DNA sequence: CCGAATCA
DNA sequence: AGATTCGG
C-alpha cells in the first residue's frame, strides 16, 4: 500500500554510509564534506535532500515528497542498528572542508574526509594557501612566540615543554598530564590562549576555577558537557592560594580529568559518558596549592613558566594592535602551521606527555621528601642493624623514626618555618603512633640507609 | 505520486535566500522588509504565502494548497542544511522598514536590507522625515541633554563619556567596559533611560540588581535569555552598599557579562549560548562596593556622574510634561539622530570603550595602592641593596615588607580609619606570612625603589 | 488537489478583520460583540462558524466541513503576519455587549465596538437601563459613599482624592502614583473594594502583601501574570510595621509597578511583558514604613484617609444587609455611573495622578528634611562666606556640616527620640566622613542660606 | 469532503443543552442525571454516545463511528462560544440521582435537575426512603447530638449556633463568618465532623493548620485548589498556643478565606479563581490566639464550645461501635434530614452568619 | 480505468 | 481539486 522503491532508496543511501548511528544512540550525516550532527533535529531528511542528486532520476523525483522522504528516513533509522562509535583517531584534524592529517600534513576532503568520522570540527573552512610557512604572518607570529618564550638555553626546556603542550593541543586523545602556565599577569599566557582559540575555532573551550576547586559529579554539569569531544581547555582566573578565602586545587578533580570518558551529567539529557580528548591548560599568576598531593598527582601535572613581561627573563613593550590581528584570525593559519610542525617534531608518531611538578613549592617539598623519605618496607628490615643506633626502632616489622627526631632532621633539609605548615600537614597526613607518643612516619632517610 | 513542481518551487524560493537556518538551528523569514523569526511557529508557510506573488502563475496557484505549501516548507527545511549564523555587523541598525547604517547614516530597505540578517529590530518603522536635525524636537532634546549633563569643561570629560556610552548603546557587538551612572535621585539618569528606551523600542531592556549580586549560572535564567541579542541594558535600583542588608557587586558577574556569548539557561529550552551585544548601563544613587576588586575589573568598569538636579554642578526646575512627550516618542527620532551623530563622532570606524574606575572609593583606593604597591619580582631583587635598610627583607627571592611597617606607612597615604575596613580587607586578601609573624604583602613602595 | 474557494473564504474573512494577531503572537476573535481570546484553544474555527452566516451560501456550506474549516483557519493564520497590538486607548470600557466610552458616556456595540480591540472586558453585559442616575440605587450608594467619606471641607481634599482614585480605577493606562487607603478596620475601605469589584466584574483583581514586601522578578510569578491587562488592583492585609516580624514596603517593588509593561514570568509560558493598566490601591490599617525612601517614591505614592467608622470624623451604625446587596450587584450600575461621572469630572480629557506622601510619618520626616536639608552644590559654594561661621566647612567644594552639629540641630525641628530610629537611618544612609570623624551630610539648612 | 448531517446533529444536541462551556474555559456534560466534568478527557464524545438514543435512527447510526462522533464533538466545541458560569444557587444540593432543594425539601431528577448546573455532587445516589424523619436512625442520631450538645438553656445559644453552622455547611454561597469548635480532646467534635463527612460525601474536605498559620498565595497551593467548589472545610490540628514554637492564626488568612472566589495557584493548571462556597470549621482544644486583633476579624469569628466529654457540661460513657455505624453511612440520611430541617429553621429564606467574638 | 469508499 | 483501496 506504499512505495516499495522507498526502501530501495534507503538501502542505496545506506550503501554510501552517509549516515551513521553513534555509540550514544545519535545520528550523524555527511553533508558538505562534514559530519554534521544534531540531536534536537534529525538531519537525516536534510541528508536525503543533499544526496538526492547522487541517485537516479527515478529516485530523486520520489525523494521530493516530504512524506516519502520521512518514510525513507524511518527506514534508514530502522536499518541502522549497530551503534558504531566515532572519533577514534587522535591524529586527524577536522575542518569545514574536510580533515587535515597531523602526520603528513595532508588535508583530505570529500569521500577522503568521509572515511574519517569527526563529530566536531575546527569551525571554519580549510585554506592551504594561507596554510603556508613562507608568509609574513608566519614570521611575525614566530617573533611573537619568541618574545613570549625566549629561545634561550635557560628557557630551552621550558620553551620546548610549551611547544609540546601547544602541539598536544591538537591531540584527539586523552591528556595524561595536566599542564600549568605559571608566571605573572600579561606575560603572554593570554596572548597564547587567544592565538590558539583563533587557530582552532570551535575546538577551543575555556573555563574558570570552578572545575578545579569544586566537585564536578554533582547533578547536572554544563562544564563537563561542553568539554566533551574537545581539543583544548583553558583554566584561567586562579586565586591567591597563600591568602584566605581561596580554595585549593582538588587532586580528585585533576585525576577525574584524566580519563578517556570523564563522567558528568549534562542538562536535561543522559550523556554522562563525556569523551575527554582535550588538552587542559591552566592559566595562573601564582604557584598553585593542592588539598592532596601524591606521586600520581605529581606525575599528572606539568608546569610551564612565562618569563617575559610586555610593558622575568626579558622585558619588552606592549603591542596594542596585535590583539586586533589575533581577533581577525590573521595569524590563525600561521599558528596552525606552527602547531602542525611542533606536532610532527614532538608527537609524531606517538603522543608524549611527561610531568614537570618541580616548579611548585608544595610539589617541590613533596618531591624532596620522596627523594629523602623512601617508605619503610620488609626489604628495609635488614637495615635495622645499622638503623637501631640512629634512632630508627623496628615497630611491627617497620623501620620507624620518632616524630621528635623526624621534626629535628626535617629542619636540616627544609626550612622548619617556611615549610612549617607544609611539614605539619605532611606529618598529620603521614604520621602513625606506636603506642601514644612514639609517633612515627613510615619513611626512611637515605643518609642512613 | 506527488507534485514534482513543488520541489522546483522550493528551489526557486531558496534561490532568493528569503529563509535562512540560524546557527541555533532555528528558521528565519524575510517578510515585509524584516527578518521575522519564531521558534514556536515556523513562519516558512507564511513566507511562502508572502512570496507566492513573486513567482509564475503556474506556481502561485499551486502554493494556494496548504498541503502543497507544507510540502514545499518541508522541502525547504531539508535543503537548508548549513546553519548560517546572523547578526555579525555591529554598525547596522535594524528597523521595521529595513536597516539603517551607523557609518554613513543611510537607511536601507527591501533587498538592500535583506543583505543584512537582523534577528531583532527597533520595533517600529523608520521615518527619515522625523529623522532630521533641523527640527524643534531636536533643539528641545539638545537643551534637555545639556540640562542633564552641562557642556562645561569641568564636566567635559564626564559629558563626553556619557555621549560615548549613549552612542555605544547602538553597538551590535560586546561591551568591553561596564558603565556606571552615578549621582543622586532624579538627576537625569531616569530621563536618559526613558529617552533611550523610546528611541530604540524593542532593542531596549532593563533589569534590577539581581544580575549584579546573584549568580546567573544557576538553572534557568530568564534575565540572560532576555538580554541576548540586545542593544542596551539598564541595571537600576542599587542598594545602600555602606549599610547592612545590601549585597556587593559580584566581580565574577561583571566579568561574565563581558563575552560575545554569555552563558545562561533559558526557560524550557536549550539556548545557553546567549549572544551579548548590548550596552550594559548601571543606574545607582550610591558609589558601588564590590566583593572582589582587581585590575581586570577596574579596566571593565567606567563611571559617569550626573551633577545637575531638577527640582551637583547646577540646579533647575522639574518639567512635569516632558515625561508625557517621552512616552509619546516625540523625541524618539531626535534622540536617534543624536545617537547617530555621537556614534559617528566617537565609534566610527572602530568601537572604543575605555574604563574610568577612579570615581569609586574602593576602586580609587585600589588604584592608589597599585600606583604605590607595585608587586615584588625578580627584577626588583637587585633593589634589595637599598631596600634592606628600609625594612624590606628578601624572603624566597621576594622583596617583603613587614605587616607592621606596611600598616604604619599605609596610614600616611590613606586614612587608616576611613579605609580601615578597606585596608584590612586588602591585607587579608594579599598578606602572606614569612613564618608566623613576619607577615608581608608582595608589593613594593615606589618611594623606596 | 484541494479547494481553491477555501482561500477565497479566508481572504473574505480577513477582510472583515474579525481575527487579529496580537503583539504577543496570539490570536483573538470578534464573536458576540466581544474580542474573545484563548491561547490554549485557537478560537479561529469558532469564529469561522460564527461568521459563516455572513457569507454567501456557496461558502457557508463549504465551511460546514471541519476539515475545510481547519484549512481556512490555517490559511488565516498564514495570512495574518503583522502582530498588531491591541488595548491602546485608556478611555474605553469594554463589556460583554460592546465598549462604553468614558469621554461622552456612550456605549458602543457590534461593529462600533469592533473598532476597539479589547482583550479583556468587565465580565458582564452592559445595561443602559440600569446605567442611570435617577434611580433609588444611585441615591442609596451616594449616601453610602458620603458615609464612607464625608462631604466636609476638612475631608474635601481627601474625599476628592478618593473620588479621583476611584475614577482612575477605570483607566486603561499605567498608574503613575500609587494610592494608599489608610484608616482603621472596617472604616469603609472593604466596602469600597467590594463595590468596585461588583461594578467592574472581571476587570477587578486583588492581592495581599506578597508583591509589596517580596521580590517579584524571581522565576514564575502568578501575581504579575494575573495583574496584566487589568483595571484595578487592591493590596490589602498589611502588617504592623512598627512591630517586629513585619517586613517593610519595598520601594523597588513600588517603582517596578509603575511601568506600562511590568516584567515577571508567568507559569509555564513566556509572557514576561505584562502590560500594566491597573489602578493599584493599598488597603491598610497602619501607616506604612518603607525600606528605602526617596523623592521619586514620594512622588509615586498617595495616601487617602478613611475617617468614619461604622459600628474618625464621624461614627455611624453598621448595615448588615448592605453586603448582600453589594454581592447581588444591586449598586453595580450605580457605582459604574458614579465612576463615569468622576472620570469626566477629573480625568477628562487627560489622566491626573498627583502624589500625597505627607500622610506617612517616615514620608513626612523625609519631606521636612528635604524642605530643610537642600543638598549642597557648587551654586551653594558662594554661601561659604556666611556659612563658615555657622559650622559649615567647605570640604571638596561641598558645604559640609559636622555630624555633631547636624544631630544637635535636627532635634530642634524633629523629636530626636521619636525620630531617633528615623534620624539614625537617614544619617547612615546619607552621612559622609571628611577624614574619620568630621562626618557630614551633603545637605544645607535654609535657616542659614 | 465530509457529511452535512454531522453539523445538524451537533445543532440538535446543543438544542438539548446537554453540554455547556464553563466560565473557566472547561466543558461539562449531562449524563445519567449528573453534570459530569473532566478537564483531562473531554466527555463530549461520551455524551454524544449517551444521547444518540434520544435522536432519530438516521443520526444514531451516524454517531456510532468514533471519527464521526469526534467530528460532531468538534462542531459542538466550535458552536459552544458563551462561557456560561455554573453553580450559582446556594440552596440546591446535588446528588448522583439529581438535586435536592433546601427550600421546599423537594428532590429533583432528570431534566428537572438538568436545569441546575452543578459541577460537583454529594458523591452518592439520593434515597428518599432513608431520607425520612420517622426512622430509628434519626432518633439515635438525635440522641447522639443531644449528648454532644445538650438541649439546655445554658447551652441553648451554643447549641443553636452549632445547629446553624451545621445547616450552613450545606450552603453554596460564601461564608461571611468563620466558625470555631472550642473545647478539649474527644469532646464530640470528631464525631460531628465524621457525621458531616459521611452525610455530604464528596462535598466534604478537611485540612490541618497549614492554611490557618501560613501564606496561602505562594506559588502552587493544592489545599486551596481542593477547597474550590466545596461545601464545608474542617481545619483541625491546632497546636497549643501557650507553648512556644506554635504559630498564631493569621488574620490575613482568615480575611482571605471570606471571598466568593478565593485566589490560589493550582498545580500545573490555571484555576487561580477558586470559588469559595465552603463552611469553614476549625477544630481545636485551646482558645485561639491571633497575630492581629480587629473588629472585622472579631466580626468574622464564631465560637462554638463543646462541653460534654465522653469517657464540660456533661460527662457520659464512650460508644466505641458508633464510629462503625458512621463509616457504614447508617446515619447519613438521618444527618442529611437533620441538616435540611436546621437549614429551613435558620437559613430559609436568607443565609445568616453572625459572629460571636465575646467567647 | 472510472467510481465510490475511505479520506491527511 | 488529500492519496490509496476497493469495487464496478
Swiss-Prot record, chains A, B, C:
Any GO CC annotation of this UniProt entry: host cell cytoplasm
Chain ranges of the SF3 helicase domain: 157-311
Main location: host cell
Signal peptide coordinates: none
Residues binding ATP: 183-190
Cellular compartments annotated: Host cytoplasm
Keyword Nucleotide-binding: yes
Keywords, alphabetical: ATP-binding, Helicase, Host cytoplasm, Hydrolase, Nucleotide-binding
UniProt region (Primase), positions on chain: 22-149
Gene Ontology molecular functions: ATP binding; helicase activity; hydrolase activity
EC number: 3.6.4.-
Catalytic EC class: hydrolase
Family: Belongs to the orthopoxvirus OPG117 family.
Oligomer status and interactors: Homomultimer; hexamer. Interacts with OPG148.
Function text: Multifunctional protein required for genome uncoating and replication. Major viral uncoating protein that is required for the release of the viral genome from incoming viral cores containing the viral DNA genome. Possesses an ATPase activity that is required for hexamerization and uncoating.
Name of the featured protein: Uncoating factor OPG117
UniProt source species: Vaccinia virus (strain Copenhagen)
Location of this fragment in the whole protein: 323 to 782 of 785
